[PDB]
Amino acid sequence: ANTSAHDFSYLKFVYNATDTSSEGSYDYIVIGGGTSGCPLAATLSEKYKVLLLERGTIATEYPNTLTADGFAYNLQQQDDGKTPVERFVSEDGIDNVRARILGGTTIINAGVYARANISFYSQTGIEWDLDLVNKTYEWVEDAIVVKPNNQSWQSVIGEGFLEAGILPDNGFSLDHEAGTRLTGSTFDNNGTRHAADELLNKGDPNNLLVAVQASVEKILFSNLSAIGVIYTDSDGNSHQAFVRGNGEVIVSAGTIGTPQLLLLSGVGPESYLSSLNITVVQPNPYVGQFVYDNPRNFINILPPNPIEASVATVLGIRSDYYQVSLSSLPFSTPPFSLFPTTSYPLPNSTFAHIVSQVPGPLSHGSVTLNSSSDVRIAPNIKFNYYSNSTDLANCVSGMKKLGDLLRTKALEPYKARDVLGIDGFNYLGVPLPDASFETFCLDNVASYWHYHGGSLVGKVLDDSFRVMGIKALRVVDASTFPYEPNSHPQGFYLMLGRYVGLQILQERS
Numbered sequence: 001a002n003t004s005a006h007d008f009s010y011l012k013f014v015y016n017a018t019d020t021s022s023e024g025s026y027d028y029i030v031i032g033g034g035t036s037g038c039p040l041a042a043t044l045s046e047k048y049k050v051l052l053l054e055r056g057t058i059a060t061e062y063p064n065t066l067t068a069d070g071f072a073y074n075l076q077q078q079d080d081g082k083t084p085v086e087r088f089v090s091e092d093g094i095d096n097v098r099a100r101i102l103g104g105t106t107i108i109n110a111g112v113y114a115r116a117n118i119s120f121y122s123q124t125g126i127e128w129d130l131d132l133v134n135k136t137y138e139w140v141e142d143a144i145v146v147k148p149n150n151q152s153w154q155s156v157i158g159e160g161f162l163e164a165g166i167l168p169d170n171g172f173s174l175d176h177e178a179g180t181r182l183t184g185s186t187f188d189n190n191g192t193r194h195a196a197d198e199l200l201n202k203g204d205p206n207n208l209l210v211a212v213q214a215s216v217e218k219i220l221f222s223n224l225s226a227i228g229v230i231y232t233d234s235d236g237n238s239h240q241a242f243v244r245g246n247g248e249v250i251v252s253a254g255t256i257g258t259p260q261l262l263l264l265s266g267v268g269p270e271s272y273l274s275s276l277n278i279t280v281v282q283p284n285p286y287v288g289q290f291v292y293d294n295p296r297n298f299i300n301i302l303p304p305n306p307i308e309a310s311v312a313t314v315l316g317i318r319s320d321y322y323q324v325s326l327s328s329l330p331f332s333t334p335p336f337s338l339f340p341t342t343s344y345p346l347p348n349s350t351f352a353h354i355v356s357q358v359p360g361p362l363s364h365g366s367v368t369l370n371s372s373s374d375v376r377i378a379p380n381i382k383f384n385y386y387s388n389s390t391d392l393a394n395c396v397s398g399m400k401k402l403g404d405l406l407r408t409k410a411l412e413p414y415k416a417r418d419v420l421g422i423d424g425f426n427y428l429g430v431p432l433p434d435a436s437f438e439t440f441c442l443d444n445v446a447s448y449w450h451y452h453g454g455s456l457v458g459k460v461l462d463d464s465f466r467v468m469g470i471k472a473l474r475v476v477d478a479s480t481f482p483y484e485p486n487s488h489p490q491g492f493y494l495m496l497g498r499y500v501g502l503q504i505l506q507e508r509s
């Protein structure tokens with residue numbers, strides 16, 4: 001793609017759920033207009049009538065989502081129930097965020113684009129059409145992805161990774177490969193955000209109807225088949241929508257949304273649903289189970305001279321750790337989730353946020369219901385950070401190479417004092433301390449935001465993403481896989497939306 005404004009042509013078929021029919025009928029119903037939901041609804045609309053339902057509002061109502069400068073603002077903003085960012089604290093005690101807006105998480109993310117690790121396709125066991133996967137990537141890339149310009153700090157970090165030994169230089173590539181590279185960005189060179197909601201423009205306007213502020217409460221069932229959905233609007237009125245012959249309901253509500261909805265619909269572990277007075281429709285002990293979040297571990301350096309704020313574009317990739325940095329302006333209001341707690345020091349000037357990601361992870365928790373009736377009340381979530389010791393070992397290696405990174409001649413001009421050690425840097429929060437690095441990771445863990453699981457392929461779904469037992473029901477979002485496709489997963493899930501959509505249209509033909 002090239003540099004342009006955010007395309008809002010799709011708004012002609014966007015309605016508030018208050019202005020939709022009491023009893024609707026469509027060929028396909030997609031729940032959650034997010035990273036996978038938006039391309040899925042658009043792909044299916046090329047031949048059949050599609051309803052896309054979204055609990056959040058349209059992005060124009062919150063303009064700071066549409067720029068690179070306003071990334072922190074959305075996290076800084078108070079969660080009133082209507083805002084595009086929803087705040088939650090996991091049972092682990094770590095602050096986190098999720099999207100509540102048309103376009104989904106792509107509207108509020110750091111904008112880093114990357115294609116999946118090629119080994120991911122083979123290790124899943126699913127028989128992927130590799131040629132179609134690549135064409136789908138190109139389809140996403142020609143719409144919302146650009147080659148980023150040179151950024152002073154990002155180029156410093158890129159030069160630092162190579163000096164630290166993360167080899168080789170891959171140059172500009174979208175592929176998740178070992179070494180250092182400039183990757184793709186969904187922020188354009190003009191600073192305009194380009195997200196999943198723009199892929200709705202690529203679907204047929206006569207077939208697709210998008211309903212914002214549509215709080216999907218329950219999936220309806222009748223051999224067991226999914227017949228439709230119940231969703232409530234701004235006014236509180238219940239609506240019903242149903243699928244036609246050979247049509248399907250697909251759940252794209254996310255890692256948190258999808259398992260919560262499935263459990264509310266009576267699809268989950270038997271004894272658990274019975275303990276909540278929910279009529280069990282389909283027993284499956286894996287709904288809400290196996291929920292993962294990759295650990296973020298970080299250091300903040302405060303350079304003596306001001307540095308230009310930048311979007312994350314240059315990645316340092318190894319098998320056991322994924323590394324990147326983001327330079328930011330200072331703030332008096334803390335951006336929620338960026339740091340694990342609100343009890344955290346505020347930056348006095350422009351700072352560099354330098355992070356490392358643990359692959360997997362092998363540590364897992366669950367999504368469980370807090371309310372047995374209301375979908376608007378957020379479910380309980382636990383990740384069990386570093387419950388597995390291999391994840392802690394992978395952090396140790398990552399902190400060591402971040403240590404190596406600070407020792408580079410590339411990052412040398414950003415030291416406050418001209419001293420041999422890395423204490424020459426000024427730090428916001430906790431600096432780098434073999435047993436000493438274990439404690440640093442356990443105490444100063446943040447969420448990388450790349451959480452996945454809850455409705456796994458091979459546990460809840462088959463190899464074609466259909467929920468086991470139930471006919472005419474599928475799940476396409478981040479809840480589907482137990483491990484990461486790459487360091488930054490949006491690119492995979494944007495592709496996955498169209499991919500499954502194209503597979504469904506193949507079946508019908």
Ligand SMILES: Cc1cc2nc3c(=O)[nH]c(=O)nc-3n(C[C@H](O)[C@H](O)[C@H](O)COP(=O)(O)OP(=O)(O)OC[C@H]3O[C@@H](n4cnc5c(N)ncnc54)[C@H](O)[C@@H]3O)c2cc1C
Nearest residue numbers: 032034035055104105110111112216257449478488489490
């Ligand atoms: C702050 C942040 C920064 C990130 N940075 C990057 C990055 O730089 N690069 C990258 O590749 N990835 C990044 N990620 C991770 C990545 O964006 C997500 O893992 C991914 O987009 C999840 O997509 P999804 O489709 O599964 O869920 P979403 O995109 O969230 O889609 C789900 C949609 O369903 C809606 N919904 C939920 N329940 C219901 C319901 N009952 N009825 C109707 N609608 C419902 C939600 O409001 C949401 O809009 C970031 C994530 C966060 C939070």
Ligand SMILES: *[C@@H]1O[C@H](CO)[C@@H](O[C@@H]2O[C@H](CO)[C@@H](O)[C@H](O)[C@H]2NC(C)=O)[C@H](O)[C@H]1NC(C)=O
Nearest residue numbers: 003004005006063066067068188190191192193
């Ligand atoms: C360059 O950046 C600016 C700001 O991101 C864009 O200005 C927006 O333009 C649309 C109409 O095209 C308006 O609805 C918005 O209100 C503008 N935003 C702001 C913050 O002023 C501009 O479109 C971008 N241009 C290109 C070619 O990418």
Ligand SMILES: *[C@@H]1O[C@H](CO)[C@@H](O[C@@H]2O[C@H](CO)[C@@H](O)[C@H](O)[C@H]2NC(C)=O)[C@H](O)[C@H]1NC(C)=O
Nearest residue numbers: 302304347348349416423425426427428429431
């Ligand atoms: C911004 O805040 C940091 C917070 O610590 C200050 O960094 C310290 O600076 C002194 C020298 O003035 C060092 O002896 C300390 O070791 C630094 N602390 C850490 C944790 O690294 C920094 O000085 C502040 N900025 C300004 C301009 O005063």
Ligand SMILES: *[C@@H]1O[C@H](CO)[C@@H](O)[C@H](O)[C@H]1NC(C)=O
Nearest residue numbers: 115118130131133134174175
């Ligand atoms: C798919 O894309 C990757 C790079 O993204 C390339 O190396 C590979 O050869 C492609 N495969 C096919 C089957 O087109």
Ligand SMILES: *[C@@H]1O[C@H](CO)[C@@H](O)[C@H](O)[C@H]1NC(C)=O
Nearest residue numbers: 117119120123177178318319
């Ligand atoms: C890609 O995935 C494989 C497992 O399928 C893993 O061993 C490898 O480390 C990954 N590559 C990178 C560069 O992370």
Ligand SMILES: *[C@@H]1O[C@H](CO)[C@@H](O)[C@H](O)[C@H]1NC(C)=O
Nearest residue numbers: 362363386387388389390391
């Ligand atoms: C970590 O996960 C692996 C999965 O292969 C498993 O063998 C082991 O039980 C876990 N280890 C710990 C220490 O929890």
Ligand SMILES: OCc1ccccc1
Nearest residue numbers: 110112312324326355
């Ligand atoms: O993934 C890039 C990133 C990491 C941490 C904070 C902001 C952006």
